[model samples]
Target chain A: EVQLLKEMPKPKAMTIDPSLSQKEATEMVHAAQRFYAFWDTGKEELIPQTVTENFFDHTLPKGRPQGTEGLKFAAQNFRKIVPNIHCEIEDLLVVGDKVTARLSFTGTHNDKKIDFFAIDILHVKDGKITEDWHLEDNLTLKQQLGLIA
Target chain B: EVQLLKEMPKPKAMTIDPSLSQKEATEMVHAAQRFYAFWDTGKEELIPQTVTENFFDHTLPKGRPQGTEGLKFAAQNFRKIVPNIHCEIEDLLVVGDKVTARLSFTGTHNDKKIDFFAIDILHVKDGKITEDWHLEDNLTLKQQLGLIA
Candidate 1:
């Protein structure tokens, strides 16, 4: 089953958008890169470094807090669930002030291997992520974790 | 409970990119609109009208087919599970031959109402969608469907 799973390609520069100055585009992509680095390394500092103080992690479940602290909280909790978690950026594209990325997350949970995918759209400005909307393949994750049959 | 759910706004023009001609951008947006129309109306004919013969539906689960007909099959099967399914385009953006959309689906199953969301990115050329990558909020769907606690 592991061999059957498609391996995500290495992270690279996001799609080029000619309308934006090279500097602006690079900063936007870097903002996303830094944010995901927190997930990969479990370094909570990366969240504050990449996102704005008023950042909105819209992917947080209903009623959950939003902002830099909330984003860090979610990342910390997830890492607690899968301590050896790793993230791979499968696809990343930038348009206007938005950066959209497809990601693959792999780890072990309850001694069972788990691999899942997610699509995230982030709003970036001045080298900081202001908002984000992301959806993970929870069906696969829950099934892999035995949370659902 | 329903009132607490944020309502998706009306479908309108997607984000504009100055690099693309008005005609080109319009057609790209129209291609996504037509494809989503198939989901909203269950008119399978719309699939062929908007997607190429060899279109790739990358979101199909493992072992399932990938071409145009496979997309139709997946759509048909879903409609069976939620006969009154309706889709709303919450957000749509186009950049460099790509159209990404965030959508919300609402329906009933087993006498319980269900509302879920998805993000889909389609590569459009000559006004036809050539490939699609999408992720849906399956955790919410399963919870509302009572498949999970």
Candidate 2:
């Protein structure tokens, strides 16, 4: 069952009004850039400060690995396989409380090439990153790896 | 040749506060529903009034179609081919000056099936619709119709 929000809390009452001012929006984009920097450098310590404590890392049509701990685990696992993984943000759109980044992840693992495109949505609250909704090219990944016949 | 906003205008100074209140947000959804209603009923006259005169229809990837006449032409062409086109809004999110809707389109044409999905973004101005950005499954449509091989 789809969990639709029947009643969302009014934005006005939310303390610290997380609405992105132009500067704040630019900062958030920078923070996202920092996230990619950490990912490429394999700096796991940076993850905690960048992502919310209860951040959600989701894969559509697949269940999410919830919370920071889960995100850390997933990151570590991917790092183990794709040691040189790098993500390049191709497009970024920010409006209201949402930020969507279209990116390309490329890496070489065990002399095998890997590349995929993805779009990720980040929700910010009180100047801290909170939730995430991700959409990626799983079919392309599978086809590239010859996993799908 | 990418055009970047050198400086974003202050939110307070924005002349057209198309941002909807909670009640207005609900009404905007209803307005979208009305647009779909007109589309289903083949009411050509209502199309011009429902959409802005200079509305940007980005259903095609090349770029946005220009003006209300362009929108009418696209709608009329679709209606002619698929006499029973219907749209169902699955989800709606409204925040500040923007509204996004996840919708599915269903119709039949020439004994061929036409089922596609789209996500639409609308920018409102002073309670009137201004710009529309749409992402739709045109490739799927082409493949389903055997136009793409």
Candidate 3:
């Protein structure tokens, strides 16, 4: 006699809860906007209130710097070198508690040039950013700027 | 003492969280492993349990497929033409409930050859997958497969 391995109901399709409030959606958009604004303007001062205090990344394990003050300093230093830095978002996707943005960054290094194609992820909680992950190519930028040679 | 207001706090060097919970870290690693396993084995049965039902992407807004059943059909059809498909994870990073994986795929098409590279993001919640964001070069794949002139 053949026996079934116990009848089980098929798992139902998982649907995104409709309760993902509009306010949450707006907050995600705002967060992406603020990050871009800071990146383009080099206004590191806005980093603290805009970004989570404990930002983290695995790609840049050496460190992403910390706090608003730290970010401001790095921004100032970077500005001294690459006076004109700008980023354009090629695409942006926001789902539940995550936002992924595909971006292109262009800057002038000395008289040469630099460019970056990268992705940034922001994790949101309670309408505030809790963490981040960035995957980018500094080597590509160096090669473009002739710094690698 | 004269100190620039903005430079008051020295930036603390950032470091990867070495103490991240093993369970959380392992979950990401396993998810990535399973992804590669399914791609390599061409096992249609595994796709649904690994992927979310409403997997949506802005890049393919026309709608790629709905659920596990849809993905299975697609994979099975592809496998019929390319029997020896294999995917390897070149790199993986996980931070704050999000995992980004860099992959290299190689296969034989019509006894010819093909290679491909892709990046995918897996979002997991409560120990189960919730969504996926994938970017790949299908045009290149087609070119390599001799499917296009």
Candidate 4:
């Protein structure tokens, strides 16, 4: 069973881009942390602070918009399904203009708990995410959710 | 269609452990490169040079052994299924004793081309990998293989 966290701890930055200054790296990592925190907390205000207006989510769900508005709508719909969902950052790294993260999402649905892994490669510039490529462990998730055998 | 590589290019090291010497970092990255190259070429000899005898693969397939022997066997079976498979390292990073990589695998099976992505977190020490945690885009892989609708 998935063990959801009541309080999300700050994720450790495993590595930072060598070419970026310390301040720049901190800003990039902080932007990522805020975006991920929004996933768990469903805080709409974090969206504008973390991502640009033209943010492109490469792995948008069907019928969702490609930008910040889509992210806000997704969080609202997802929280309705998994109200106590929690996100844990397993690993975080910064290389060049991208911030890569390994994340765990744990939640409950219909009294059954589920935990799944995801990887996100986010392009951050000027302390805001501009684009992202992501993939999740959908096979395991579907099996756990009883959507597949 | 997958474009099979006749010659695999060496992967770049985006970051290395700050505490390690240049020589140590080079060895660690080179060991990872050799291991990834073995996946493309199916060269059995590279196994011994890159991983320890007691290598623990956290994501081994069913019926496969848990050590270096299992890796060798898996490579043999995989190459049989996708003889022209090419492994591309999309990103590689070294943090502490761990070497993390984002990889792309492209090949053909039953005359049908397929492409998949994978992430590997490997623990390296003394120029050899001792353990690994890995995940692949199995949903996409299965869909492309026509195993799922």
Candidate 5:
């Protein structure tokens, strides 16, 4: 018997996770996003069940999150500054163990308000969020918040 | 005539750009990186040779760039604050017409110096940079520079 195979239809290139269907990645990002919303409200418990105890966030300007405790501090302070912070996902893409979220945040310090953007590239491993590189345009945000000259 | 198109190996999912080759995208990102360096100087005759007249940048804070004039104004004022500002590309990645650059910026103001990170996503079209989404963590940098609450 001769071995016969079908020519699979595939993209020419630019695939970081070809074997894993996008469904899992998309769901992972979505779950992470819900946790973000939950954390922003400071309503849910300390750490999200989806993140590892050794999770790290690299986007903080002052006190970057090193682990679960650090994330709580960051989240608490984040809410203190802008109580009405809501992150809206604009563009989300996943490649391999990484999921990139382009978020436009709408927030207010009550007296002052702002509409800014951030890009968070999160790395997920062992079915849990492990690390992230978060970037936000804070200068513009500060200006919008009337915090700077 | 014999057809030999059936023997092909392909990944199952996660393809961001199918039409363009990674090589071309990498080259485009590299070219844009060179121009980013060019614009950082803020020297005589502003604007990089790599951008078009319609080129738009979203890195500015309050006085956002509306056209080339806006960009020039922002550039001029930026130099006033951080007179000796320089941008160094640390990492560069490309996908389709979008290029993400990890930039390290060095600047000083009234003897206070600071080094910060910014993620710049450049959109290139027809071999020229057309748009940019720039995100920088300024709160930390300001704090590092001794800017108080």
Candidate 6:
């Protein structure tokens, strides 16, 4: 009621950004692939090669540190728990400077199974990843981890 | 480790679905605009105009029902709690038949302020949405609702 007067972007009259050309978009996907491939346990040290020096890992929830170092730490932390983590890039979409990857994750944490879907949107600039937004199926993960009753 | 031998699609050999032209992608975003606009009260009845009869809504968790009927129920249920609910289509990305929107939601529920982020992947066909995948920041939502510490 009272909030209706607040100034905000209207949902009508859609405004979509001009998208990348097929060639440029394909290049972004390749960069994303190189970035994801860097998630390999022993080679995650290559984070510096796939991301900008000031890379922002928006994939992390608020209150956690932000940056390329943060991304490296998050990957290492997850691998410590699920040493055999594997993510298969199932599908990819590109628009403007962003790339969305639909992936399936498989791993074992404490001998518990892991098979679930996750989506990651990476923001690209030049040829390196600058930041990202990611979401995974929490309910399925919780149930698989016995954290949900 | 044995799974490493599994053949996977090569990333260097890029493939972009040539089905959706630039104009078609823009149209899909407009269709998405109309679909989200239907989330408003007294207008949700307009859903069928933008969504197909077999719409699959994968936004809910647990024992909730599925499909178009389920989406109607969920929208109505939320509106009852937050009459001023609003969603702003903050970003859009497209590939093939899919439209990915990164949106922000705001409203009041039980006197609790609403401010969170969400992403929805709508698969469009025949200029209407046929199915969707959605995820939101639930932890922030719970805290905003005073359910978290």
Which pairs of residues collide in candidate 3?
none
What is the Å distance of residue B136 in model 6 from its true position?
A: 1.8
Candidate 4 clash pair list: none
Candidate with the larger DockQ of 3 and 6: 6
True contacts kept of each: 0.51, 0.00, 0.00, 0.17, 0.34, 0.17
* By lDDT: ranked, best first: 1, 4, 6, 5, 3, 2
Candidate 2: which stretches are off by over 4 Å?
A: A1-149, B1-20, B58-65
lDDT of 4 by residue, A10-85 (tens): 5643655456677777778788788888887888888898899899976664567778888888888766766777
**Highest lDDT model number:** 1
Task: Please write out the lDDT profile of model 1 over residues A1-149, one tens digit for every residue.
Answer: 01111232336434546687767776776777786777677677777788888887766876457787777677777777777889888777777888788888999987899898888888888989889888988788878887777
> Candidate 5: DockQ?
0.24
Worst 10 residues of 4 chain B by lDDT: B1-10
DockQ of each: 0.54, 0.07, 0.03, 0.28, 0.24, 0.11
* Candidate 2 clashing pairs, residues 3+ apart or interchain: none
**Candidate 6 lDDT, tens digit per residue, A1-149?**
01111121111212122345555654565566666666534366657666888887655765557887677676776687678987666656665677776666789989799777777778888767888888777557766877654
> What does the lDDT come to for candidate 6?
0.64
Q: Which ten residues in a row have the lowest lDDT in candidate 3 chain A?
A: A2-11
TM-score of each: 0.87, 0.50, 0.48, 0.79, 0.71, 0.77
Better of 2 and 5 by TM-score: 5
lDDT of every predicted structure (CA atoms):
0.76, 0.55, 0.57, 0.76, 0.60, 0.64
Q: What is the interface RMSD of candidate 5, in Å?
A: 4.8
Over 4 Å off in model 1, which ranges? Answer: A1-13, A62-64, B1-13, B62-64
CAPRI class assigned to model 5? acceptable
Candidate 5 residue lDDT tens string, A1-149: 11111221111212233334556544455445554554445544625665777877766555554776776676677777787886656655444466555667787776777788887766777556887777777666777778676
lDDT of 1 by residue, B1-149 (tens): 01111232335424655687878877777787787787777677777888998898777875457797777777777776678788888777778888888888998999899888899988899999999889888778878878677
For model 3, how does the per-residue alpha-carbon lDDT over B35-83 read when each residue is reduced to its tens digit?
5666666676655655566654423312345555555555677677776
- Which candidate order results from sorting by TM-score in descending order? 1, 4, 6, 5, 2, 3
